[PDB]
Structure formats: structure tokens, C-alpha cells
Amino acid sequence: CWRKRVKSEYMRLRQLKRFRRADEVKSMFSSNRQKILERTEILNQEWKQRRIQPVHILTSVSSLRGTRECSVTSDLDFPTQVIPLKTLNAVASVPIMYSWSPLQQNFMVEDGFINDEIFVELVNALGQYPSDKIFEAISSMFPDKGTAEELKEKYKELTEQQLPGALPPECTPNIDGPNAKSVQREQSLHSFHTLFCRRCFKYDCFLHPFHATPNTYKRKNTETALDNKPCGPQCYQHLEGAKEFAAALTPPENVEWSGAEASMFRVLIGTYYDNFCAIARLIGTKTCRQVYEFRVKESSIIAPAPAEDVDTPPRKKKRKHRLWAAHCRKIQLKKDGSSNHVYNYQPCDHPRQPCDSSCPCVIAQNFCEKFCQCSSECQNRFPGCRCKAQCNTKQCPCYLAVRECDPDLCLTCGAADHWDSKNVSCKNCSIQRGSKKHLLLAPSDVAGWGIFIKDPVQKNEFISEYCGEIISQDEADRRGKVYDKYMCSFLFNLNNDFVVDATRKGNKIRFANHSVNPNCYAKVMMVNGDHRIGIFAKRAIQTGEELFFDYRYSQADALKYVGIEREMEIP
């Protein structure tokens, strides 16, 4: 009954639609033709303002005899032509190198026709004209159509762009803006807390996933001595009412209390909790007496500042290293009995639960760095250096297994001080500081592009970190299939979860070749909660000497990819 009418109307509306589209493409083609005509005219006028010397035929003048002969034949009646063929001068070729991008730090990355326009056209065209019969019909004949209930709901709805738009559900524009309405402190700080990464201080971290715990974590509120002092003519104290309000916490006036000012007062009181003098000083649109009045009003509105803090009573003269060693021995004897694998470090947070065998880091056989929310005196944490000399010796704890010197934990070795100077004494804070050695790029032996060292470097000295883009192991296999088919791989295994790919990004050290007898070695070090690959000199290296390091490939893989050993009379 209603089938043929709905079919007729749908065909006619679609006919009108594609006729409009055809007319639009006609107009676009005509306008583009006009642009082509204008621009070609100006180019042709430009070309007519000069003169080009006509090229003539060539005859053997230089190298009169003994040159090659070039000929072109014709299928038709035209005679075969022969001319002397001349050789172009040789040019020094260069080895193959695909495009790559400089990197001094790792870069974590992640892993028939149909369109949505036809669905929108169906929704709006049918929505303009109960109506459930039309949807039922359009779903009945056409196999690809359906969900008539959603179509009926859209018909009942406005079927128009009635959404607020680019404004978020809680519109919190720039505080300095004219429409900065008052919001909660967490709401105003939500973006920073969600986006800021504490491991390397980058907003929208380049090597750490944003799926991390926000700033809403347990912390001490004893950030100041809370010393009482007058502020001036307007103050939270020195007045009878002001003194009474201050005592109660621990009349308001119709001031120009903007929404931005109120929001900023809330933000500051959610971090200071005790001192209105500083909050009044920081907010220029606030009076200290009015500041106290608004603080009292807000406290009577919702709640006062709790200002909770802890003291961590227990302590001892050797409460850092001996129990550390005991805990490490326990975790090694229970599960971490071998070093056949290494896991990526990720900070663990608990609701006051301790870092027992269920801790992600303890079950991962990793020490908690400062990024863990374990505890202020977490027995699993790494304490740092006590060494008062060069930290290149196997007796320092941080250097011992594979770890660099944390610049906030190792204090005596010198990894903390002189942060802005190359002159450092720790010698185990190199890959964190980017103390790379100058490298030159040149076509090497053995292979194509190879890396070279400018100045001589003694043994066990640091050379540029093997930077790259940090990827997963499955993605590593994915792109390594292609790389292996290309017989050129820049994949460096980082740990059991991740892997460094130096193909699309990296630094100069990516070109260092392979040799069964190398002058450099690579060790994967724990650097401030991040696994990084540092290249170190296996022996003293002369100036201008090419850098090699073993790839530790399997024997078959090593032979078939990097089997060129550079030597044949070694024994």
C-alpha cells in the first residue's frame, strides 16, 4: 500500500539531490577552467619576454675516435639516424638512506564503498515528512536499511544541530577571559591534572600514556609554617571581626567579586588551606578582609579546609639500605630468581594498601622510583648513591645491575648538582643528561651508512643514546616483517613489553654497524623510571674510527643479515 509511494518519493528526492550535485560540479569545473585560463595566460605572457638559445646536433669533437654510437630506427619510411653518443662525467654515488627524523629522547607511539553522508540524507529527507510507516517501508524492501525505531525517534526529535557545540559539558574558558564562570577547583584544574605527566614534565607526554592516575593522590598539607602576620590596612586579622573569624576558622561587602576571582580563590584555598594573606596577594582583584569574608561564606556554604597531614614517625640510622637489601633478597628468592626478562616500569597506586606481592611493580620485579605512590618509606624503593667518587665502578648500587643515577636520589655522586653544566663527576648520569659524543655520518665499510667518532674516547665511556620510537612487541613483529623483507632493521629490544624502533625516528647512533668484534657495547639502563639504551665504548676508540656494536642476533639471523665480519685473517 505505502511501499510504492515511499519508493517514488525516495527516488525523486535522491534524483533532485544528485542533480544538484551535478550542477555544483559543473559550476566548479567552469570556475576552475576560468582560473586555469587566467593563470596560463599570465604564465604565457611571462614566457614571451625572454629568448632561449636553440640546441643543435652534436658531432664528435672531443674524443674524435673510439666513442660509442647511438642510433634510432623508424618503422616508417624515415631513414635510420646515427649520432655519436657521449658519456656523462662520473658522480660519486652515496649509500641508500630512507627518511628519518632526529630524536634525542624516545617517542612512544600506538598501533565496497560506504559513507555517513547517505545516512544523514536519509534521516533528514524522511524526517521532514504517522511517519513510522515510511521507516517500516524503507526498511522492508531495502536489505541494507533497518532500525526503524531509531528513525522514528529521530523524527520525534528536533533532527537538528541543537547541541551546545564546541563548549564542553562544563564550560571553563581561560580565567583571564570575560566568561570565566566560577567552578570547582578540580573542575578548573582537571585538564592539567589529567594531561601533565610527572615522569618527564611534559603536557601530553610524548613517551608516557595519558592513562595514569591524576593529581588526586595522598599528600601532606604541611606546606608552610602558617606564621601569623598582618597584611596591611585590609587584612584577615588586626580587626575584631577579622580576629574572631581567624580564630573560628583555625561582614561581607558587595565588592566586584567576578566569577574568575571566585574560582581562583577556590583554587588557591584548595592548595593553601590556611593563609588568606598569600591568596589575597596573588589575586589582585581581592581585598584581604573581603578575602576572609568570602572564605567564611564558602566555609558556611559547603565545608572548611581540612588541612590533613602525616609525619611518618618511624626512622633509623640505616633505615634505607639494609632493609632494602633484605626486601630485594626476599623478592628475588620468591619469584625473581633469574634475570631472563625485564618488565616496563609503571607507577603503582593503592588506597593505603601496602606494596605486597600484589604490587604491580613488585610482581614486575622493579624497584619503585619516586613516581610510585607506594609510600614515603616504601621498602621496595631504590634509595640512591652514597658513593663520593666516579660511579663507573661495579660497587655502586645504582650502577650495579643496570641503572643510572637518579638526580633526586643519588646526591653524593654528583648526579644532582651542576644540572646545567657538562662538567659532572658522577659518570653514571650521562644518558639522562644527553652527554652524547660528537658523531659524524659517512659511508662506512662493511655496510652503507655508518657512524664515526670525532674525538677519541676511552673504554667504558658513554656514546650517544640509542633513541627511537617506543612501540609494542606485536607492532614490532608487524613492522619487522617489512623491515626483514627489506633487509634493513633499526629495531632495538628494550624490555619484555616494549622495543625501540629507530627507523622512522632516532639519532646519529642508529647508523652504527654490526661486528662480531665491536668497539662499542649497548646496555639497557633504567633511567628515571624509563628504560633507555646507552652505547658505551668497549675499548679505547681512536679519532675518526668507525663505531660497531654487537646486535646479539641469533646465529642464523646474524649470518643472514649482518654476516659481513670485516675480517678474514683474524686467527
Binding site: A325, R329, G480, Y553, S554
Partner: peptide
């Protein structure tokens, strides 16, 4: 095929006199 590096070395035993 991936380039590899040697694994960890261990952690210091507690100091004790003979």
C-alpha cells in the same frame, strides 16, 4: 630480528664483618 643487550647484574649483599 631485534638488537639485544645484556641483562641485569644483581643487587649488593648486606655488609657484614668477618
Amino acid at each position: 630480528a631485534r638488537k639485544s643487550a645484556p641483562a641485569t647484574g644483581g643487587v649488593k649483599k648486606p655488609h657484614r664483618y668477618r
